[PDB]
Each structure stands twice: as C-alpha cells, then as structure tokens.
Design a protein around this nucleic acid. Structure first.
Lengths: 411, 555
DNA sequence: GGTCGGCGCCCGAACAGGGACTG
DNA sequence: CAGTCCCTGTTCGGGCGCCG
C-alpha cells in the first residue's frame, strides 16, 4: 500500500541489453533457490521475451559467510539512470568517516524489498538465469520491489532510512553513518569493545523496523606509498642509470626534480658494472631530490565533479601498488598491498582482493567508486574474477598492458 | 475464431513505425498451387483468416521444398516487418551438448508436429501479418489472409515458442522433479531413473499434458528404443557419436567449397581428435570472390588427406559422470595450433576440440597455452558447470618462472604436468642484474619521416662501434635493428642499453614468434646467448654512450 | 531456395588509443 | 604547442558448419 516513486532513465537512452555469462553449478542452484523464494514473496515475477532488456546475474559469498547472496550487475542500468540519484535525491558524504578509529559495514539490502518499485520501471530490471549445458531456455524474471545493487534504491529509501536512524543518531551524536549502495558504514572513535556493542545496538534497532553483517575497517591506520630512492653507499653505472630514469619519470609529478648533475656522471661509454663515485654536485642533487619526494605535490585536491581513476601495478612477491587520481600525475592517494589472499599462487585472486580494498577506501574517503585500469588481459579477467568477488558493489574497469618501465612505485 | 488454449504473448511495434506495405513477388505456377492448397487448409483450421480492404498492410510470400518429403513449407519474407517490430530477448542461450548428459535408466525422444502452428499470436498484432497470395491469373485480385499463429520466418516466433513451451512444461516439471527434460524448441529429451514401467506412464502423462494445450506428440516421431537420434547425434546406453559427416571431394575447389569444408571440419573436431584446419584456412586469407577457384597448396593437400584418414575410423564419446573428476589434456600440435580432450576415464573422451587463434603480433607458447586453458574453462562451465583438472605439457617450474615475473596478472587453475613432447618452455631468460665482465652496448636508431631513411648502430665500452644505413624504415624498426646489431656482434654474454620503450616492451614479453621477420631474427639471436641484460635510459639526457650513438644515427 | 533465431570458426576492414616527432 | 603516423589491439560485418 506504499506509493511508488516515479523514476525515468536519462534522456535519449534505452535500457541495458547485456547478455548473461555462463555460471557454475553451485551458483545456478543458489540462484534458483533464491529466485524461487523471492517469487513466492512477490519480490520478483517471471516475464517473457517481449521484454528486450536484460542484466547479468551471479551469486557470491561474503568474507567468512556460508550463505549465498544474489548479485546483479546493474552497472549499465546505473549508468543510464545517473541523473536521478545525484541531482534530486543525493546523499551527503561525511568527511569525518575516514578519520574514525573503527568503521563497520552492514548489508542492509533486505530492507529495499519492503518498498515497491515503479511499475513503468520494472521492465529495465530484467535478468535471466542460465541452465547447465543449456538444458532449458533462460528463466527470466523482473523486480517488483527496490532491487539490490541499483543506485536508485538507496536514494528512494533515504527518507525512510533517515527516520529509522534518527533515534539512534540522537542517542549517539558522535557516531558517523554513511549509506552507499546496499551497505551502511558506521564509524566511531570508541574503543573496539564498546564499538562492537553500539553496532549490535544498531543491529537490533534495525531489526525492529523489519530488516545483519560485520566487516571492520580502521581508516586511521591507512598509509600511502611514497616514491623512495635507494640509499646505496657504492653506486655503479647501472645504478645511476636506473636512478636517472626513475628521477626523470618522477619529474612529471614533482617539477623540481633535477638530473643534470647525475647525468654528468654518465658522460663516458662505461661498463654497467663499473663503480662510479658521486661528485659533490651530484650528492647534493640526490639529497635535494629526496627532500622534494618528502614534500606533497603542489595543487592536488579532490574534485567532486571529476571521475576517480585507479591504476594497479603487479610488483611481484605478493606486492601490489596503486594510485588514485582524477587528473594525470595529480595522485590523490598512493598505496601498496602485500600478502593478500592467494599470495604466491593466484594473481587473479590478489588482483580481485586489491580492487575490493581500493574501492572500499574510495567509498570511505570520497563516496565514489573509481574506474580501474587493470594489469590483466580481458579474457583472463572475465574468466576468473567472479570466483573471488566478495562485495555487493561492482566498480567499472578497463584493461591495460603497460610493460614495466623503471620501477617508480616499488623499490 | 475460437480461443487457443495457450496464453498469447503481447507484441508491439517499435514506437513511431507502421506496418509493412510491400508488393508480392511473381511466383511460379507450381508454388502457387502449393500455397493455395496450404492456405485453404490453414483457413479451415483457424490458423489464417480472410481480410478485406480495411487492412492496408501486405508482405511477400513464397514456399520452399521440405527435405525428403512432397509437402511444402510456407515462409513469409518478413524482412520489413522484422525491422519495425519490437526487439525481443532470445531465451536460447546456447546449444545443449551430449557430453553434459547423465546416464539415465530410460530415455524417450519426441517431436511435436507443426510447432508454430500450435501456438497463437497476439490478437492486437495479427493485423500487421497481412499477405497476398497471387492467383494463377495475374488479373485476379488475389486472396489476402492474416496469421492467427506464429508465422514461420518471423523473428519473434522462435523466442515466443521457447518461452510458451517452457511455461507449459513447468507444471509437469514441478510435479515430476526427478524427471529430466531437455527442451530445445519442439525436441524433448525425457530421461529418468524410474523403473521402465513407471517411465512409460510418465511419458503418456506428459503426452496428455502437452495435448491439453494443443501440442500433438505423434507416434511417428516417438522414440522408445536406443539408439536415439537427438540434436544430430546417436545416443546409446553407454556411448554417443555424431551422425555421419560427409566432406566434398571437389576436383576444383572454389572459396565457398573451402568454407563448407572448414565448417564441417570444425564441427567434426568435437569428437574427432586431431583435426587441423590451419593450412586450409590459409587459403581463405586475402581472397575476394566466393566463387573464385583456388588451387590447393602442398601443405593444404596433406592436411586434407590427414583429416580424411581420421574421419575413416569410428569415434564415440561418453556421458558425464558427476561422481568422478573432470580432466582436460592439451597438446601443442602445430605452430599456433592446439588440441584438447576432456575425459574422466583414460581414453574415454567426453569431447575434444582445438584452439588456434593468433592474438597479437608477438606471442609465445606460454601465452597461447593460457588462452587455450581459458577457452576450455569457459566451454566446460557451459556444459558441466565446473572447471576440469588440467594436464598441461609445461613444466611446473617453467610456468612458475613465467607468471611470477610477468607484469600482467595471469593464472591457471589446478593442473599437473604431463610429459608429452613437444613441451612448452621459455626459450630465453633476460637477466635481472647486469652481467659482470660482459661488453656493454649502447644502441639507438632513428629515421626521417619523409625520406624513410635512417641509421642504426651501437657504441661499446671496449671501443667497438658500428653504424648501418637503412632504407624504407621507421623510427620503431631502426631501434629494433640497433638491438639486432648488438646481439649479432657480441659474445655469449652482453649488456644492452637502449632508449626505446617500444623495443624493450616487445622483448621483455619473452616472445618466441612474431609477424615481423626482424623480431623473429632478434628472437633467434636471443636464444643463442647465455646471458642477456637489457636496460632502458631516457633519451636526450646526455646518458653514457646513448647520447654518443644518438648523434651518430641522428640523420 | 536466397525466411527467422541460436551457438561456433575464420578473415578483413573498420575503429581507437597510445606513444614519438615536428610546425 | 596540436597535428601527424607508426604500431597494436579490439570490434564488427559476412561466409560456412550445426540445430530447431
């Protein structure tokens, strides 16, 4: 008996038409049971081929979770409904969420099923469930309520969400709560003990309204990866060559970098393994360049109207570096991950875990998901990435093949 | 007109576009009799109805012969209607494969007679399916009908039938969950582990459940005894095989004949292991006319004779056993060619196949092997919903060296080494640190964008030097040429310093094959060496001999 | 014959993005 | 400086195979 919020696509744009990719047996059985139950609860209803729209669907398991979770790739739908959840019903982003000692994420996707969807918009939420060996044609459904993973769901439910959170926000005014997609980020400076207690207070405060998760973050312990120069006591020709190339590349970021005196040491046609003593003018150019790398870049600041972009480099031995920027060489944040799940054996798993950690950090700091430049072939990524996904959101990505130049981000 | 028992599918035209208004083709007198005989019969059965001048739409119509029968089939050239009709989402996501079938006690195959003619069309959409039937006299006005069912030749008919058919089978499948029904259009593969007595009962229960909605299951198309003919195969209680394949034996081959040959060889490669189409597909490159005669090359005739000899012996596949693991084994066959076999017990193949796509101007066997693994993995998840265990002709240390040092993310699922030559291996390893006591070469190359002329040479720490004039070249080709010279004139251990990102990116990818003959020569020189160390320095920075050799090759 | 849809292969041509060099 | 071009990869259009 709830009124529907009318939603429209962006002008001059049709709905998504993305084919469904093959799914494993364990995922198909998980989707069949969930879709059968959701159809019984009226959340979805079967449709036919007259609906020309479709969206890929697959299943996941969150970290340390046994139950399967239905996940839909609405990226294309979210790209074709962008003006709704940014202009009309936008959500503010708390700048203090990233400064908290502890931040916990909660899957509040089940609450969206309590609100019906606009009847004219149900046509675009269409998806298909494949069968093993194509035993049967595709079993199609469409959503009758607010779908999980749609960027219009948290905007419509925002007014209902604020009234649920007002009794808890008034009791605990120093706690910061942010809502992105199907997740709720609750941050506080409380001690770890009473922090988890206040979460369970909110878990029960949400259960009484008709709604459970627990992933802990510590943004105050997030570190950046700076560009560092080696501290050798004896330098060879090859060392100084690599040093100049790295300092030459870093000059695009720090305009004050100079390699004039160091290049003078490479005047002759010397053997690479030959030891070269550093001149007095070169030792000062080396020390001044180290100090410049300590300084922050001049004129770097976040633009809310610009898209976030993230690049990742495979540094070997379980090492992965990354940089987040909106304009080239104006990196908002750098970093490095080490010894993730699948280290020393599976890169796709490490690359998937790295995208998740980076995206999570972007949500906490700016409230946006970056577009990724992934160091992997397209077919290699599209084959294995779903097998290691553990998040309810999906960032956008593209594939690059930049051979290693001169190790700028890792020693 | 009576109401059909099946629920109709609402269909619209695209917004702002009207029905078709196109004139009828001139028809031969033999096809006109076949159409009028079929049109008058379908009008009596309520499948087409007469229309008057109030219907302003029209579309052509013709008829083709049915295979191995005197009956004719009525087809409508709905090319203009298909353009303005709404887009449908096809529910047929793929084609089933016998390798995914599980051993069932009893099997039954049936095909419904005239499938489309049993499913109704949307009432509001019947008006746009208007066509004229020309008479034996050109002056006779002609009989205009409109469809009441799914017209054969319409783009919406297959998508509508497959969805309408699944809706009718759901009540039976819901009551009979342990029954397996492979549904492809009108083809129903019904298998179960029930005893053969209760199996025939459930078969007749379904033949009446389908009859309630106007779907006839003729006993002519009924199949109770093995072997069953299902989707172009022969299903036996323990094994399956494709229905026989026939290749043309042309004395003079055109381009279309090779395409028909290549297509059947690709279809045969599913169970016929070792089929190669490399030398035959080389006949299709850079050719324009479909009817152009092409002579067979010596390498192409040998490949065809080998494929004919494989098709002589009988091959058969087995069925999937979910209790045992899935295994896939690959073999390097030819350069750029790979074959594989998927099985659970040795020599009992579920299916075979081949991978031969050449990706990139530069590649190696390790890249091609990884591409083949992914192609098999996707193919397996389609048919069995799982990833098989791999037996790969590559050393465990060989692969460990590759993926750990490569800058791209790359990974292969659970696999084990099989010692089947030829083995995939890296042909050279670039040193990580500069070689002590090795001559150090500073190479560079340049070219003029207009004259297409340039130089390429090197300078070493031992005073050695060389510069070579080059004609009809580019900046990229010269920088590769400079490295080729350094590799030619050096010993077994050599340090090379370049400023070419282009050249350094190609070599560090450890390629063993290339479309460029220059890269192939650089590869051949890298294999002969024992230790090679490449390095990159920025150009125009006054670095080492890289500035001395940049000035020599400047022009 | 020159109807529709699905999947697969092969090739060329179109598109498209990133470097290096030049007015 | 933007305008090229040299290179390389990707997407697509059009043929065959096969099934319904």
């Amino acid at each position: 008996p709830i009124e529907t919020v009318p939603v429209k696509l962006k002008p001059g744009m049709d709905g998504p038409k993305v084919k469904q990719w093959p799914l494993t047996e364990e995922k198909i059985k998980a989707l069949v049971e969930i879709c059968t139950e959701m159809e019984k609860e009226g959340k979805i209803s079967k449709i036919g081929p007259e609906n020309p729209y479709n969206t890929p669907v697959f299943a996941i398991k969150k970290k340390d979770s046994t139950k399967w979770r239905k996940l839909v790739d609405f990226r294309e739908l979210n790209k074709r409904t962008q003006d709704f959840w940014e202009v009309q019903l936008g959500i503010p982003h708390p700048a203090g969420l990233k400064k908290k000692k502890s931040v916990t994420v909660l899957d509040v996707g089940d609450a969206y099923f309590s609100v019906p969807l606009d009847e004219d918009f149900r046509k675009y939420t269409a998806f298909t469930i494949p069968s093993i060996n194509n035993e049967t044609p595709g079993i199609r459904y469409q959503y009758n309520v607010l779908p999980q993973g749609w960027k219009g769901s948290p905007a419509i439910f925002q007014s209902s969400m604020t009234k649920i959170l007002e009794p808890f926000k008034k009791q605990n005014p120093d706690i910061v709560i942010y809502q992105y997609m199907d997740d709720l980020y609750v941050g506080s400076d409380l001690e770890i003990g009473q922090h988890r207690t206040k979460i369970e207070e909110l878990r029960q405060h949400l259960l009484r309204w008709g709604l459970w998760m627990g992933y802990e973050l510590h943004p105050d312990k997030w570190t950046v990866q700076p560009i560092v120069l080696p501290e050798k006591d004896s330098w060879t020709v090859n060392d100084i060559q690599k040093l100049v190339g790295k300092l030459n590349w870093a000059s695009q970021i720090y305009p004050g970098i100079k390699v004039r005196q160091l290049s003078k040491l490479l005047r002759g046609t010397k053997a690479l393994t030959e030891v070269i003593p550093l001149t007095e003018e070169a030792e000062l150019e080396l020390a001044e360049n180290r100090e410049i790398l300590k300084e922050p870049v001049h004129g770097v600041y976040y633009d809310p109207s610009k898209d976030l972009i993230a690049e990742i480099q495979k540094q070997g031995q379980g090492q992965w570096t990354y940089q987040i920027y909106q304009e080239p060489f104006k990196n908002l944040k750098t970093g490095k991950y080490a010894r993730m799940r699948g280290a020393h054996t599976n890169d796709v798993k490490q690359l998937t875990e790295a995208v998740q950690k980076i995206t999570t950090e972007s949500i906490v700091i700016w409230g946006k998901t970056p577009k990724f430049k992934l160091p992997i072939q397209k077919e290699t990524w599209e084959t294995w990435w779903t097998e290691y996904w553990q998040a309810t959101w999906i960032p956008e990505w593209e594939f690059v093949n930049t051979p290693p130049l001169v190790k700028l981000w890792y020693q | 007109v009576p109401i059909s028992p099946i629920e109709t599918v609402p269909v619209k035209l695209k917004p702002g576009m009207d029905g078709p208004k196109v004139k009828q083709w001139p028809l031969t007198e033999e096809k006109i009799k076949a159409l009028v005989e079929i049109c008058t019969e379908m009008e009596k059965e309520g499948k087409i109805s007469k229309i008057g001048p109030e219907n302003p739409y029209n579309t052509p119509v013709f008829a083709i012969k049915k295979k191995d029968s005197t009956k004719w089939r009525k087809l409508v050239d709905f090319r203009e209607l298909n353009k303005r009709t709404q887009d449908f989402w096809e529910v047929q996501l793929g084609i089933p494969h016998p390798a995914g079938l599980k051993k069932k006690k009893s099997v039954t195959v049936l095909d419904v007679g005239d499938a489309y003619f049993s499913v109704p069309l949307d009432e509001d959409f019947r008006k746009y399916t208007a066509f004229t039937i020309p008479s034996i006299n050109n002056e006779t006005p002609g009989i205009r009908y409109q469809y009441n069912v799914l017209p054969q030749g319409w783009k919406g008919s297959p998508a509508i039938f497959q969805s309408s058919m699944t809706k009718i089978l759901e009540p039976f499948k819901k009551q009979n969950p342990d029954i397996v029904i492979y549904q492809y259009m009108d083809d129903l593969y019904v298998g179960s582990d029930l005893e053969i007595g209760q199996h025939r009962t459930k078969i007749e229960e379904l033949r009446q459940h389908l009859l309630r909605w106007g779907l006839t299951t003729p006993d002519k198309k009924h199949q109770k005894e093995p072997p069953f003919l299902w989707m172009g195969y022969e299903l036996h209680p323990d094994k399956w095989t494709v229905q026989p394949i026939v290749l043309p034996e042309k004395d003079s081959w055109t381009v279309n004949d090779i395409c028909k040959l290549v297509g059947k060889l690709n279809w045969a490669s599913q169970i016929y292991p070792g089929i190669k189409v490399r030398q035959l597909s080389k006949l299709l490159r850079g050719t324009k006319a479909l009817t152009e005669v092409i002579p067979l090359t010596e390498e192409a005739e040998l490949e065809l004779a080998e494929n004919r000899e494989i098709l002589k012996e009988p091959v058969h596949g087995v069925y999937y056993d979910p209790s045992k693991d899935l295994i896939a084994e690959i073999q390097k066959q030819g350069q750029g060619q790979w074959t594989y076999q998927i099985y659970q017990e040795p020599f009992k193949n579920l299916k075979t196949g081949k991978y031969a796509r050449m990706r990139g101007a530069h590649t190696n066997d390790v890249k091609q092997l990884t591409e083949a693994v992914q192609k098999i993995t996707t193919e397996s998840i389609v048919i069995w919903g799982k990833t098989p265990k791999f037996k790969l002709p590559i050393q465990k240390e060989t692969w460990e060296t590759w993926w750990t040092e490569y800058w791209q993310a790359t990974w292969i699922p659970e696999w084990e080494f099989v010692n089947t030559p030829p083995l995939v291996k890296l042909w050279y390893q670039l040193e990580k640190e500069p070689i002590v006591g090795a001559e150090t070469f500073y190479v560079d190359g340049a070219a003029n964008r207009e004259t297409k002329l340039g130089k390429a040479g090197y300078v070493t720490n031992k005073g050695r030097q060389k510069v070579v004039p080059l004609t009809n070249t580019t900046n990229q080709k010269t920088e590769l040429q400079a490295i080729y010279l350094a590799l030619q004139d050096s010993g077994l251990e050599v340090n090379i310093v370049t400023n070419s990102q282009y050249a350094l990116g190609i070599i560090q990818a450890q390629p063993d094959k290339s479309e460029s003959e220059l890269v192939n020569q650089i590869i051949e020189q890298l294999i002969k060496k024992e230790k090679v160390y490449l390095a990159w320095v920025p150009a125009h920075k006054g670095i080492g001999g890289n500035e001395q050799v940049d000035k020599l090759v400047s022009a």
